[PDB]
Design a binder for this molecule. Structure first.
Ligand SMILES: *CCC(=O)N[C@@H]1CN(c2nc(Nc3cn(C)nc3OC)c3ncn(C)c3n2)C[C@H]1F
Ligand SMILES: *CCC(=O)N[C@@H]1CN(c2nc(Nc3cn(C)nc3OC)c3ncn(C)c3n2)C[C@H]1F
Lengths: 289, 283
């Protein structure tokens, strides 16, 4: 009862928002039968085909998540392009957000985003769910103070080589510890204000340079404390990498003294919003717990 | 406290479409544009019709912004220009009065009785906060979702007023109980006008002589018994909102025993879908 089966006639796609490997996302409108209102939604149109048991069985798990930092699948319409319905996130993806606001993001926002993504990932691990596609492009901004992990369970379809752990590239092993690798790359994206990992290196070569010990470089704003966490996420031995429960504690500790661990020009100028502005955001856009 | 009311600039929101007007001004559907961002967030804007009277407005606006109950609307922001503009959350379904009129052939007893419970819960909170509504009516109950209504517009409606309010300008929580009875009558009549065609200047006379709103056709006597008790001349003899919650909740557990509707809730599937999209606040 956590996945609504929708009819073609009760929603409409109105504007294209973007695409990735698993199809196209639209801003759409849900029109409840009998009512006069139009409710904004996000619609993902898929494009892979090989069942009416495959997609639904995974969608049910997708609709079952319950964590403030994990996006929940809300509905589905089984047409020819299967359309998945979720909540609309007015701010877009975190990657573009950091790129567009890279001159307005202080250490407190960056570290709190790291904490929240780790909380969302720890939730997925607790539920025995492997993401397989964690990246800055798959973190949605609900409010600037509240981010949520998206695009989970689209393993019914198909690769993000430059975010994948070495054992995933070589052996197609996907575990929670391989998610820890992708988490490290996601943190690198945020701390570089949206740089492209291994920029200009063909994907067919990533496993080679990883085997020889090359890793993503230290972002200029990172102290050695933060970069060591990222490097530990990229250890070849998956069991030696940190766990999401541990990443929550460490990044939460750094978030209590953010200017000690990130060196950003003009940091003390940007703070978290006052309780006035957070209460205003939550009342209008973010009423969940 | 002070951080529960946002002071907005003219340049960070825009009125886009009129929704209606009431006693004190006009309500618009609007868009809030956060400074520095590209997003447009829908809001409701109430612009009054008529700097230091603003000290009056602000002192009450802070109290309006301090209420916090799942069935009570909270004032969110204010913009002080010429005419003062008040900002709250937009309710895509509108009020309960127009909703019951437009859906009067699809509303069952369970919805009606649960609405009575929820309005009573919101009023009991206001009494707990020692706040007198003074303008309770079906037109001032907003529909967040069909399963979730909230009381709005606090901080003359003769046909909703208790007799002591008409005669002596006495407003108490027990006079709110009178208005609650009239609000329940509106819902049970599917949006009928109280004392239709009777001039407001004559209402106090008919009340003193014992005339009351008639029993709605769908109302069983148990429900009409409650409504009549809300309209007793002795304000202390009327029920309390804490008691109204218990009684209407009891009837809501056997709704077809207490309301007789020709052709008489959503599945947990549909409620979970509504709440995720429109109503994440905890209740
Ligand atoms: C950042 C790159 C990216 O991930 N692109 C596409 C589209 N995605 C997406 N975006 C939003 N919110 C959004 C973006 N823009 C420009 N406007 C809005 O909202 C009005 C979103 N909300 C919910 N979901 C599921 C979204 N997806 C996902 C990628 F496919
Ligand atoms: C039933 C009595 C009445 O109609 N009073 C009008 C409506 N106003 C009002 N409406 C809404 N929600 C709403 C109304 N319509 C036609 N569309 C929507 O949503 C798109 C509302 N939300 C918050 N506030 C303060 C509202 N006021 C008030 C009177 F003008």
């Amino acid at each position: 009862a956590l996945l609504r089966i929708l009819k073609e006639t009760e929603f409409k796609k109105i504007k294209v928002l973007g695409s990735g490997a698993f199809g196209t996302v639209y801003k759409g409108l849900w029109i409840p039968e009998g009512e006069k209102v139009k409710i904004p939604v996000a619609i993902k149109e898929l494009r892979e085909a090989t069942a009416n048991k495959e997609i639904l069985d995974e969608a049910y798990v997708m609709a079952s998540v319950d964590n403030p930092h994990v996006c929940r699948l809300l509905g589905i319409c089984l047409t020819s392009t299967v359309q998945l319905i979720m909540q609309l996130m007015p701010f877009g993806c975190l990657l573009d957000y950091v790129r567009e606001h890279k001159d307005n993001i202080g250490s407190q926002y960056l570290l709190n985003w790291c904490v929240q993504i780790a909380k969302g990932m720890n939730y997925l691990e607790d539920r025995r769910l492997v993401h397989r596609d964690l990246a800055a492009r798959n973190v949605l901004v609900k409010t600037p103070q509240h981010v949520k992990i998206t695009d989970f369970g689209l393993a019914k379809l198909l690769v993000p080589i430059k975010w994948m752990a070495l054992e995933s590239i070589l052996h197609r092993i996907y575990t929670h510890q391989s998610d820890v690798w992708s988490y490290g790359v996601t943190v690198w994206e945020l701390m570089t204000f949206g740089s492209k990992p291994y920029d200009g290196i063909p994907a067919s070569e990533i496993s080679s340079i990883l085997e020889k010990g090359e890793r993503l470089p230290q972002p200029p704003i990172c102290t050695i404390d933060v970069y060591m966490i990222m490097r530990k996420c990229w250890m070849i031995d998956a069991d030696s990498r940190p766990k999401f429960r541990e990443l929550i504690i460490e990044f939460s500790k750094m978030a209590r003294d953010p200017q000690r661990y990130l060196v950003i020009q003009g940091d003390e100028r940007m703070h978290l919003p006052s309780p006035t502005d957070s209460n205003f955001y939550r009342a209008l856009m973010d009423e969940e717990d």
